[PDB]
Design a protein around this ligand. Structure first.
Ligand SMILES: Cn1c(=O)n(C)c2cc(N)ccc21
Length: 123
């Protein structure tokens, strides 16, 4: 149907916008601390601590499968990256502080993205 095609076009343009957001968020992590899943070989007890691991590569895989239906779903995953890190790592670590900085800088990007999704009407 034309309606299904129209909805698929909406999802595709949402995906385009979220790809830009993801690229902007990742630019705020030049250390690439959050680029890949935390290695279960290098951190064997990680899953005892963190029940839902997340990272930018995993997000990007979901993104390209058009697996984010709305911005809230995308934001949930971004929050997991930050929140997991601030639980597993202590306050005085380069890891924790990198999450804080990514959170603070990412908030600007997500604030305008919310307005754009609402304005253009993508969900
Ligand atoms: C974000 N993040 C963590 O929380 N841990 C424990 C990590 C370990 C490595 N090796 C790389 C990134 C990491």
């Amino acid at each position: 149907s034309m309606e299904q095609v129209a909805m698929e076009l909406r999802l595709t343009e949402l995906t385009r916008l979220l790809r830009s957001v993801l690229d902007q968020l990742q630019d705020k992590d030049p250390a690439r601390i959050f680029a890949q899943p935390v290695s279960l070989k290098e951190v064997p007890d990680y899953l005892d601590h963190i029940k839902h691991p997340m990272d930018f590569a995993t997000m990007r895989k979901r993104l390209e499968a058009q697996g984010y239906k709305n911005l809230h779903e995308f934001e949930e995953d971004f929050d997991l990256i930050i929140d997991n890190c601030m639980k597993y790592n202590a306050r005085d670590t380069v890891f924790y502080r990198a999450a804080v900085r990514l959170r603070d800088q990412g908030g600007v990007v997500l604030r305008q993205a919310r307005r754009e999704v609402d304005s253009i009407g993508l969900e």
